[PDB]
Design a protein around this ligand. Structure first.
Ligand SMILES: CC(=O)N[C@H]1[C@@H](OP(=O)(O)OP(=O)(O)OC[C@H]2O[C@@H](n3ccc(=O)[nH]c3=O)[C@H](O)[C@@H]2O)O[C@H](CO)[C@@H](O)[C@@H]1O
Ligand SMILES: O=c1ccn([C@@H]2O[C@H](COP(=O)(O)OP(=O)(O)O)[C@@H](O)[C@H]2O)c(=O)[nH]1
Ligand code: NA
Length: 379
C-alpha cells in the first residue's frame, strides 16, 4: 500500500456519493486508503457512515448548532493540517460542492498536496445560485489536479475554463453506484424490504404519495415560506394523497417547516431518513418535489417526475429530457405543475420516463482506474 489516498467529506450527500469509492479503494491491497470526515454534519453524516459500514480514520468533530459558513471554513482549515501531517497522503480526494469541499481543497492547495475532485465541473453560471455551492465547486475545480466529471457537459465546462484535457476524466456520477447498491439491498432481501416499509405505518397503500425535501440556502426565508404555502394548497386540494416530507436539520428550514406545515393531516413531516429508507420512499413515490442536487439525479434515474423548486439548476439533462421541470418557489406554478401530475395520467406517463446521463453505476471503478493506472410524524 505505497500510494496513500485520503478521502475527505463532511455532509450527507458527499458521504452517499463517496461511499462506493471508499469501498473500492479500501478493498485494494496496493492502496493505503484513509477516510477523514470533517463532521460538518453529525446525525445526517452518521446515518450514511453506519449504513455503508464506514469507520472514519479521522473525525474533525466540527458541527455546532446554527454554525456559519465562516465557522465551517475556519474549523476545517485549523484542524485538517494535523491529518495531512499524520498521514502524508499522495492525493486528497474531495467531493462535490460543500464548504467542506472548498476548505479542504484550499488547505491542500496551500501545501502542494494534489487534489482529485469527485463530481467536477457542474455549473449553474450564477455565483449567487446555488449559494455558496457554485463558488465552492469553481474554487475546487481551479485548484484540482484530477477532475472526475459526471457528464460530457461538465467536462465541457472544465475545458472552457482552461482545465487541461488530460486532467479531466468523464467517469459518470458515483451516485448511480450508490443508488444501485441500495436498490439491490431492497430487491435481494424481502425481510429487509418489509422492515423498511414497516417504518412508515401511516402510509396507505391505496394513496398516491408525493415525496418532498427542501434546503437550498438561497431559498431561506421568503422563497421557502412560499414553497410551504404551495404544499398546504396542494394538501388541501388532494386530501386523499399523502405528502411525505423528511425534514432537514438546518434550523432555517426545520423550524419554519414545523411551524407552517405541522397542522395538516396529510402532510407527514418526518426526520431525515437514512439512505436505504429514502430510496424506498423515492421508489414508492408518485412524484417528487425537491431542491436537492442528488435527488435531481436519482429521481429521474428511477423514472419519477421531479418538480425542482429552484429558479436554476446545474443538472440540465433531466430538464431537457422532460423528466424534471423547474418550478422555483412560485406557489401558483408549483401547484399548477403538481396538480397536472395528479389530474392527468397522460401527462404523468409523458413525464415519468427514466433519464440517466450519469453512467452505468461503475463510476467508482473508473475513478480508481484513473488514479491507479418506526418513523413517527412530527407534530
Ligand atoms: C455551504 C454547504 O456546504 N452547504 C451544504 C450543507 O447545507 P446545510 O444546510 O446542512 O448547512 P450546514 O452544513 O452548515 O449545517 C447547518 C446547521 O444544520 C444543522 N445540522 C446539519 C446536519 C446534521 O447532521 N445535524 C444538524 O443539526 C446544524 O444546526 C448545523 O449547524 O449540507 C447540504 C446537504 O444536506 C448540502 O446540500 C449543502 O451544499
Ligand atoms: O431524507 C433524506 C433526504 C435525502 N437523502 C439523500 O441525500 C442525497 C442528497 O443530499 P441533500 O439533498 O441533503 O443535499 P444536495 O444533494 O442538495 O447537496 C441524496 O443521495 C438523497 O437520496 C437521504 O438519504 N435521506
Ligand atoms: Na486497503
Amino acid at each position: 500500500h505505497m500510494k496513500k489516498i485520503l478521502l475527505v467529506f463532511g455532509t450527507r450527500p458527499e458521504a452517499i456519493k463517496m461511499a462506493p469509492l471508499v469501498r473500492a479503494l479500501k478493498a485494494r491491497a496496493d492502496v493505503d486508503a484513509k477516510v477523514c470526515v470533517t463532521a460538518q454534519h453529525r446525525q445526517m453524516l452518521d446515518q450514511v457512515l453506519s449504513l455503508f459500514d464506514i469507520e472514519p480514520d479521522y473525525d474533525l468533530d466540527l458541527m455546532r448548532q446554527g454554525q456559519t459558513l465562516s465557522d465551517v471554513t475556519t474549523g476545517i482549515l485549523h484542524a485538517i493540517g494535523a491529518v495531512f501531517d499524520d498521514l502524508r497522503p499522495d492525493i486528497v480526494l474531495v467531493h462535490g460542492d460543500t464548504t467542506t469541499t472548498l476548505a479542504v481543497s484550499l488547505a491542500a492547495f496551500y501545501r502542494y498536496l494534489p487534489i482529485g475532485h469527485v463530481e467536477a465541473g457542474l455549473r449553474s453560471g450564477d455565483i449567487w445560485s446555488p449559494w455558496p455551492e457554485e463558488l465552492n465547486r469553481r474554487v475546487t475545480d481551479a485548484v484540482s489536479s484530477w477532475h472526475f466529471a459526471p457528464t460530457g457537459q461538465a467536462r465541457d465546462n472544465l475545458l472552457s475554463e482552461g482545465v487541461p484535457v488530460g486532467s479531466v476524466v468523464m467517469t459518470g456520477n458515483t451516485v448511480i453506484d450508490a443508488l444501485h447498491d441500495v436498490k439491490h439491498m431492497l430487491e435481494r432481501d424481502d425481510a429487509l424490504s418489509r422492515e423498511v416499509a414497516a417504518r412508515f405505518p401511516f402510509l396507505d397503500p391505496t394513496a398516491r404519495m408525493v415525496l418532498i425535501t427542501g434546503h437550498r440556502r438561497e431559498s431561506f426565508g421568503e422563497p421557502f415560506r412560499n414553497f410551504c404555502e404551495a404544499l398546504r394548497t396542494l394538501a388541501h386540494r388532494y386530501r386523499d394523497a399523502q405528502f411525505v416530507y423528511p425534514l432537514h436539520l438546518n434550523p432555517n428550514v426545520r423550524e419554519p417547516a414545523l411551524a407552517l406545515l405541522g397542522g395538516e393531516a396529510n402532510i407527514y413531516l418526518i426526520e431525515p431518513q437514512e439512505y436505504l429508507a429514502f430510496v424506498y420512499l423515492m421508489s414508492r413515490s408518485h412524484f417528487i418535489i425537491t431542491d436537492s442536487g442528488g435527488i435531481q439525479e436519482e429521481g429521474p434515474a428511477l423514472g419519477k417526475p421531479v418538480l425542482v423548486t429552484r429558479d436554476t439548476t446545474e443538472r440540465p439533462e433531466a430538464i431537457r429530457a422532460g423528466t424534471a421541470r423547474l418550478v422555483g418557489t412560485d406557489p401558483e406554478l408549483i401547484v399548477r405543475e403538481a396538480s397536472r401530475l395528479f389530474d392527468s395520467a397522460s401527462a404523468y406517463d409523458e413525464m415519468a420516463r427514466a433519464s440517466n446521463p450519469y453512467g452505468d453505476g461503475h463510476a467508482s471503478e473508473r475513478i480508481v482506474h484513473a488514479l491507479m493506472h418506526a418513523e413517527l410524524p412530527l407534530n
